[PDB]
Design a protein around this nucleic acid. Structure first.
Ligand code: MG
Lengths: 122, 120, 114, 215, 48
RNA sequence: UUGGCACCUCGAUGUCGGCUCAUCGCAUCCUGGGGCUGUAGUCGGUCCCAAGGGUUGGGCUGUUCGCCCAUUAAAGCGGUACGCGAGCUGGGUUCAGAACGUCGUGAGACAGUUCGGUCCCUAUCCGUCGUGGGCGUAGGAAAUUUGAGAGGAGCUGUCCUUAGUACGAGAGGACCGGGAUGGACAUACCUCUGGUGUACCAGUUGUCGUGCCAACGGCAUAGCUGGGUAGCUAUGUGUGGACGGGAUAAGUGCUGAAAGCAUCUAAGCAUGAAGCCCCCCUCAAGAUGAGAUUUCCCAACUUCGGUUAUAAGAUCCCUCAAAGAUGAUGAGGUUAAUAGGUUCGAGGUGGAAGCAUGGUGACAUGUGGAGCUGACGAAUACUAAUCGAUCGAAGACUUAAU
């Protein structure tokens, strides 16, 4: 359950090492988000270099959360850390790799380049 | 279950003390609520007594207080010994009950329905 | 038991081809993933963390490490989506729920066989 | 079109055709009997009355609703039935497809209908504005003394009164609620149980009036 | 939070219409014939 | 709004912002219907009908306001003692302390700043939210009820399709309808995910005690720590606002004359909105108009009912919870499973005690998923609902049919 003022790790090589969120897109009054949902956020720790630099405002997608998700069969997938990936306003990543596991529910959101450039779909 | 207008430690203590005293006297006078709540505790202790194996003895030692009864002819024995030698035999064939309750009229200082809980 | 009518109406959904295990055992659960246009199988491997009330309502949890990122999947025990469960190896624990593995990584999360 | 009186037993789960977890409630409908056939010229509206369960027969010196009273024995004996415990009626039904004295059986429902279950809610007793009415309560710190009470009950001199409908503390529960567009997953004819997808109102051991969606 | 006016004798006597003690639940005792409370032990005799 | 007047209030009408709760207008911010346009459709602008619903989260200031950062379909304007302090705060302002700048010879002063500065009240009445008793409904009762009325909902996004089609040098680009998913919000429920679970299980520290080791109890926030049943719960699970009628608003017409033409109008007759009415959910015969259906009860003294006691039915009393502040509601009272206990089981905890083996010891292993197990499921009268008491009909006239 991700709301504004929540710090997330970036799971990509965009430059951003860790970021925090401002809004959850998707509706007036929308308050929370889970895997497959986009958020506006501003990086707080960048790598020296990288395409994204510290203090920028960026669109981003949640790829793993500690709250996790119910699946239609009564199966639940949970994780040990929140995480996110930056996007280029086309459901495409800004970086060239992607670190760590990803949840299968991103397949539906048509974040296919995120699902294709991933260590483990789950 | 009931709380008896009292905390947890003070109730645990009251219930076990009241059960011990009942075992000593075989019939006591108290208020309905506490009779209704000591019924189960004393009934379960007698069950621990209908087996008499060392495990049940050790386990029933948890609840009973350590008291001494002077029987006829200056014979002395404690609450555990009474439970396991004078009350186990009496209810070896009965498969429940073990206690009855006889409502009495309200007391004077309060409007509490005094009752007499007795070992049957 | 539980209510008899609950137990009767849901007895047909219980699986019997399943093995017997306990928390702490590391195992391989196989799952029919009907992703794409194929019913593939993904051998999920983890350490059982807990399991809950009987009936169709029993659910068990398994924990693993993917890329240094802990992942846990709860599965209903009698889900028809599980092809098979192999207790790949036994485990000597002293709990019934193993929540205390969410803070350890590496040899600290060690388990003795049998 | 269809209607059955039942009682709620609990909830469980079933697994669906594609693996989906289905949340379900077990309802027990047994010996539902028609006791009358209301008619437009006799009573002004056409409908049928169904009795559910089974009370015991009259006894002299009864002290509980367990046994039927003389008034009820007579009503049920005119339908050659045993005294029943819960009696309701249905209007949506075609009165001419039923006969005074038939059994309404669980199999009236097939798998995949759309039904409305009407029961009574669980009692929460006397409650306050935050649980009963969903009100945001006040600050818990910063020197507040307004934790859970409801706020202003009105204005000032204009309307020197509290208007009707002001959401204030009191009893919660004990209200008839109709959940709509539920469906039945299976009907079992031997244990006499209609399984309904979702959850229904009421305490365990209650009463539900299942009939066919009006929408 | 103070009475804005007096409660007349009429209002007073009206409010306390339902303020009364109920006659006790007493039945005659089968061994002695004296009255006892129902479901309690007779205090005159000591029976059932 | 800034004012003017000084009419109620100085034997006191708390004044600003914020919080909680709203309620009403419409000169409408979005959504619905239209006339238009210097409208090709998307675009926008303008005006009309529309108040049913909806009409964000933050940074900065005590701020209202305003600016800014992200969103949204929109982030509307006002009334309500600039709504609401016997509902809350008290940052600003307006007591006493202090300090700076300025004015004053001075005491002191400034609507100039600045730091600090006690928010009392057990609700009588009306009002409002729930919940009982009495009586009336021309007999006394048990159950099922129609609905005069009343209340609640009423919001809307994106994607796909038609279609890259119409319309477009192009660039761009649907209308309709027809599918699919959301946001917010309201409800019901605990199966699942979790929360809590102070008479459940387990580990452990200090200390006192049952002489003693071993076992256990008291105290230390439940001493602490890991779990956790029932119940109660959301952030969890379903469901809902779906159709569809009838009358309309601005508007669009048809036939049609006064005024042989015309012309939406005067006769009449069409169509047309999230608006009106119904439709959908809930309460509802104290609806004193007191309604309807089925059933049950039905004598015998009067000296004339202003009549006992009894039916049918309840209650007293008592065991209880699916109900509960109390009373009510509901499950039960021996011809009995209502609760307790007993027996079995579910779920929870996790390998009891005592033995035997191994170790110098701290310990480990087998017995034995053992032992324990509050509310959860079933059976069993073993214990308690033993005895008894109280209340409760005999049915009015008048007229018309019979
Ligand atoms: Mg005055």
């Amino acid at each position: 359950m991700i709301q504004q003022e929540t710090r997330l790790k970036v799971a990509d090589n965009s430059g951003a090492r860790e970021v925090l969120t401002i809004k959850v897109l998707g509706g007036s009054g929308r308050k929370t988000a889970n895997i497959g949902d986009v958020i506006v956020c501003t990086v707080k720790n960048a790598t020296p270099g990288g395409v994204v630099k510290k203090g920028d405002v960026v669109k981003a997608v949640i790829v793993r959360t500690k709250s996790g998700v119910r699946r239609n069969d009564g199966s639940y997938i949970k994780f040990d850390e929140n995480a996110c990936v930056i996007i280029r306003d086309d459901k495409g990543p800004r970086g060239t790799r992607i670190f760590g596991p990803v949840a299968r529910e991103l397949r539906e959101g048509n974040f296919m380049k995120i699902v294709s450039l991933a260590p483990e779909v789950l | 279950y009931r709380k008896l207008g009292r905390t947890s430690d003070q109730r645990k203590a009251m219930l076990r003390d009241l059960a011990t005293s009942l075992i000593i006297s075989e019939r006591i006078e108290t208020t309905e609520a506490r009779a209704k709540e000591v019924r189960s505790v004393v009934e379960k202790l007698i069950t621990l007594g209908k087996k008499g194996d060392l495990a049940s003895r050790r386990n029933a030692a948890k609840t009973l207080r350590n008291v001494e009864i002077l029987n006829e002819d200056e014979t002395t024995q404690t609450a555990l010994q009474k439970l396991f030698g004078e009350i186990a035999e009496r209810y070896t064939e009965r498969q429940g009950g073990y206690t009855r309750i006889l409502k009495q009229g309200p007391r004077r200082g309060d409007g509490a329905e005094s009752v007499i809980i007795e070992l049957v | 038991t539980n209510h008899k009518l609950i137990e009767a109406v849901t007895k047909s959904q219980l699986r019997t081809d399943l093995p017997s295990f306990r928390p702490g055992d590391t195992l391989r659960v196989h799952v029919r993933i009907i992703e794409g246009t194929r019913e593939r199988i993904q051998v999920f491997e983890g350490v059982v963390i807990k399991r809950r009330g009987g009936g169709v309502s029993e659910t068990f949890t398994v924990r693993k490490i993917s890329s240094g990122v802990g992942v846990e999947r709860t599965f209903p025990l009698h889900t028809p989506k599980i092809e098979k469960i192999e207790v790949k190896r036994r485990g000597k624990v002293r709990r019934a729920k193993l929540y205390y593995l969410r803070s350890l990584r590496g040899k600290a999360a060690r388990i003795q066989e049998i | 079109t269809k209607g059955i009186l039942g009682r709620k037993i609990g909830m469980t789960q079933v697994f669906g055709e594609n693996g989906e977890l289905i949340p379900v409630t077990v309802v027990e409908a047994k010996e539902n009997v028609v006791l009358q056939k209301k008619t437009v010229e006799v009573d002004g509206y056409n409908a049928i009355q169904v009795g559910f369960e089974d009370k015991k027969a009259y006894k002299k010196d009864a002290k509980s609703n367990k046994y039927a009273n003389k008034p009820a024995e007579g009503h049920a004996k005119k339908a050659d039935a045993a005294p029943k415990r819960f009696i309701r009626e249905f209007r949506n039904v075609d009165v001419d497809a039923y006969e005074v004295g038939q059994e309404v059986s669980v199999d009236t429902f097939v798998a995949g209908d759309v039904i409305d279950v009407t029961g009574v809610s669980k009692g929460k007793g006397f409650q306050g504005a935050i649980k009963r009415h969903g009100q945001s309560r006040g600050p818990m710190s910063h020197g507040s003394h307004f934790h859970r009470a409801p706020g202003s009950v009105g204005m000032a001199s204009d309307a020197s009164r509290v208007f009707k409908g002001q959401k204030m503390p009191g009893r919660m529960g004990g209200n008839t609620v109709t959940v709509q567009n539920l469906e039945v997953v299976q009907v079992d004819t031997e244990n006499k149980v209609i399984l309904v997808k979702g959850n229904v109102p009421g305490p365990k051991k209650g009463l539900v009036e299942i009939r066919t969606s009006i929408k | 939070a103070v009475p804005k006016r007096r409660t007349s004798k009429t209002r007073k006597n009206k409010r306390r219409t339902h303020f009364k003690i109920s006659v006790p639940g007493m039945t005659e005792c089968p061994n002695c014939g004296e009255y006892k409370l129902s479901h309690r032990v007779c205090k005159n005799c000591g029976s059932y």
